Amino acid sequence: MAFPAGFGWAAATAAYQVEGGWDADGKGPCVWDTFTHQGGERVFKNQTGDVACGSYTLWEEDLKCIKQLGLTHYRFSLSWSRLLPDGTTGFINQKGIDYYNKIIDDLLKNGVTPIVTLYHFDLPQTLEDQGGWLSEAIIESFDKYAQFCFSTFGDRVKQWITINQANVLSVMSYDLGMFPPGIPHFGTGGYQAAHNLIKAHARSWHSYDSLFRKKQKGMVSLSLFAVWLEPADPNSVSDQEAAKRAITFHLDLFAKPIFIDGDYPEVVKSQIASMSQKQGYPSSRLPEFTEEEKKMIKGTADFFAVQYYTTRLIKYQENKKGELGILQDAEIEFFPDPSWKNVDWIYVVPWGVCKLLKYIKDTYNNPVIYITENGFPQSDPAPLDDTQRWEYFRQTFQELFKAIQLDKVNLQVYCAWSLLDNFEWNQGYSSRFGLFHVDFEDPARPRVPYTSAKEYAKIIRNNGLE
Ligand SMILES: O=[N+]([O-])c1ccc(O[C@@H]2O[C@H](CO)[C@@H](O)[C@H](O)[C@H]2O)cc1
Ligand SMILES: CCCCCCCC/C=C/CCCCCCCC(=O)O
Ligand SMILES: CCCCCCCCCCCCCCCC(=O)O
Ligand SMILES: CCCCCCCCCCCCCCCC(=O)O
Ligand SMILES: *[C@H]1O[C@H](CO)[C@@H](O)[C@H](O)[C@H]1O
Ligand SMILES: [Mg+2]
Ligand SMILES: [Mg+2]
Incomplete structure (x- = not known):
């Protein structure tokens, strides 16, 4: 299984998950500083990213x-609050700039x-x-x-992601309120945030296109989480339509406007409008894009950045009582096959990634695809x-090769989450995704390879596997 010459082999981290230095060198607070400092068992053992992997120092x-x-x-990722402590360029943290410049220069001098x-x-x-993201002011x-x-x-x-996993963010921060600001708004908050996240992405793409692209010649996208989905009963039409509709709700809700025509999928619009009306709302809970907005949002991605970990089965579930929420709007229930590990x-479910990559090829006109996350956690201690x-x-890499060689998917980058064991949001340090182990009890935060690090390096060196 030889991958294309020039195939990209990557690993990923994120600022709050690895950096620490949460208040170092004039850095302003971000929402996770505030959230984790409030405790109340919203995070495993009230842990914080105050230090994390100490990557700001190390x-x-x-x-x-x-x-x-x-x-x-x-x-x-760049820490917005590290670079601009109040969110604005009224005050620029030069130590923040120097830190990210050092990373960039170090990477480039090493051919990364x-x-x-x-x-x-x-x-x-x-x-x-x-x-x-519930307010329009954030777009500017x-x-x-x-x-x-x-x-x-x-x-x-030259390769930019504007917003990490915008679909998950809208749900976690603003619908379920599992992430900061931590207030539930079932069936309203996610859609209101999504509308603004899409517009802000689009605005930023046009800024790049109009102001920076000619000089800089890079490309810009946003990353999206995708769970592959199959009908629970393969002979049930209602299950078959429900699995497709649940893909449309979690992935295409964002991807269609940005990649295709600047508007939501039709089934998303009709389901939510119809539910909202029967629930007694004067407007759909899904905010409309104006005509000017559709025109702005259409064609604002230079490649498809996708994040895959897993698959689920989908059964239709009629929302007879008009219950409030995204799952209820989609009229679905999800669950794993009991046979899956x-x-x-x-x-x-490794074949999940092949099916997904085929779906992206077929739905988004054969785009360049970067997988910017894929991986597997281990329980602590690992x-x-x-x-x-x-x-x-x-097994996952065999499916990637299959997608490239059999399905002719234009996958150009595979990126493992994560380089390092890190702060796994509400799970804190209890969930270890890293290719390198980090000792969070030792003040020096030493990194040591897992076997996976050694084997992954072999894959990269051979540009494939047997
Ligand atoms: O909140 N409510 O009062 C309320 C809401 C919905 C409702 O009916 C449901 O509407 C859905 C969307 O139209 C249909 O997909 C579904 O088949 C039907 O069972 C009845 C009452
Ligand atoms: C703990 C389970 C998380 C694992 C990921 C699997 C998520 C399954 C979700 C199916 C997509 C259905 C489309 C509607 C999105 C609903 C998102 C939500 O509010 O929960
Ligand atoms: C509000 C519009 C968004 C449409 C719904 C998108 C749903 C994205 C899928 C949610 C998966 C959450 C992943 C976190 C899994 C976990 O670690 O618990
Ligand atoms: C949550 C209660 C608020 C007090 C009621 C005044 C606001 C009425 C207008 C909103 C109608 C939608 C209510 C949701 C109905 C439902 O989920 O079934
Ligand atoms: C992608 O998924 C990983 C694992 O859940 C998470 O830690 C990242 O922050 C997210 O972008
Ligand atoms: Mg809303
Ligand atoms: Mg990404």
């Missing part, structure tokens, strides 16, 4: 890890291509206090931050000789 150690893997690409994310679940607290704040990032780093950075919510986990990786 970049050199991450670089060693990157070099040892032989990565061709490295995905990391940076894949840089502007924003990864970590809004400056000030901007959340002004309504976060994000655009200006994007312009600042392009101007500062765009002479060396799992580690946490990650049920190991064995260094992680042979079982590595087996799940190998």
Whole structure:
């Protein structure tokens, strides 16, 4: 199984998950600083990202890890609150700029291509206090931050992700309220946030296109989470339609407007409008894009950035009583096949990624695809000789080769989540996704390879597997 010459082999981190230095060098608070400091068991053992992997202090150690893997690409994110403590360019933290410039320069001198994310679940607290993604004001704040990032780093950075996993963010932060600001708004908050996230992405893309592209010649996208979905009963038409409709709801809701025509999928619009009307709302809970907005949003992605971990089965579930929520709007229930293995919510279903990549090829006119996340967690404490986990990786890579060679999918980058064991949001340090083990009890935060790191380096070196 030889991959295309020039295939990108990457690993990923995110600012709040690895950096620490949460209040170092003038850095402003982000929503996770506030959230984790409030405790109340919203996070495993009230843990925080105050220190995390200490990557703000120990970049050199991450670089060693990157070099040892032989990565061709490295995905990391910029901390908005580190660069602009209040969210705005009224005050620019030069130490923040110097830090990210050092990363970029170090990567490039070692032949590693940076894949840089502007924003990864970590809004400056000030901007959340002004309504976060539920308010229209954030669109301009994000655009200006994007312009600042392009101007500062765009002479060396050519692959950009504007917003990490916008679909999950809208649900977790604003619908379920599992993430900060932590207020549930079942069936309203997610859609209101999604509408603004899509517009802010589009605004930032046009800023890049109109102001930076001619000079810088890079490309810009946003990353999206995708769970592959199959009908629970394969002979049930209602289950067959429900599985397709649930893909449309979680993935195409964002991808269609941005990649196709600047509007939501029709089934999303009709389901939500119809439910909202019977529920007694004067408007659909899904905010409409104006005609000017559709025109702005259409064609605002230079490649398809997707994130895959798992698959689920889907059964139709009629919302007879008009219950409020996204699952109820979609009229679906999800669950795994009892025969599947799992580690946490990650049920190991490798053929899920092949099916997904085929779906993207067929639905989004054969785009360039970067898989910016894929991986497997281990429970803490985790064995260094992680042979079982590595087996799940190998199986996944066989499916990637299959998608490329059989389905002719234009997959160009595979990126493992994560380079490092890190702060796994509400799970804290109890869920270990890293190719490198990190000791969170030792003040030096030493990195040590898992077997997966060694085996993944072999894959990269051979540009494939047997
Ligand atoms: O909140 N409510 O009062 C309320 C809401 C919905 C309702 O009917 C349901 O409407 C859905 C969308 O139109 C149909 O897909 C479904 O088949 C039907 O059972 C009845 C009452
Ligand atoms: C803990 C389980 C998480 C594992 C990921 C699987 C998620 C399954 C969701 C199916 C997509 C259905 C489309 C509607 C989105 C609803 C999102 C939500 O509010 O929960
Ligand atoms: C509001 C519009 C968004 C449409 C719904 C998108 C749903 C995205 C899928 C949610 C999966 C959550 C992943 C986290 C899994 C976990 O670790 O618990
Ligand atoms: C949550 C109660 C608010 C007090 C009621 C005044 C606001 C009425 C207008 C909103 C109508 C939609 C209510 C949701 C109905 C439902 O989910 O079934
Ligand atoms: C992608 O998924 C990983 C694992 O859940 C998470 O830690 C990242 O922050 C997210 O972008
Ligand atoms: Mg709403
Ligand atoms: Mg990404």
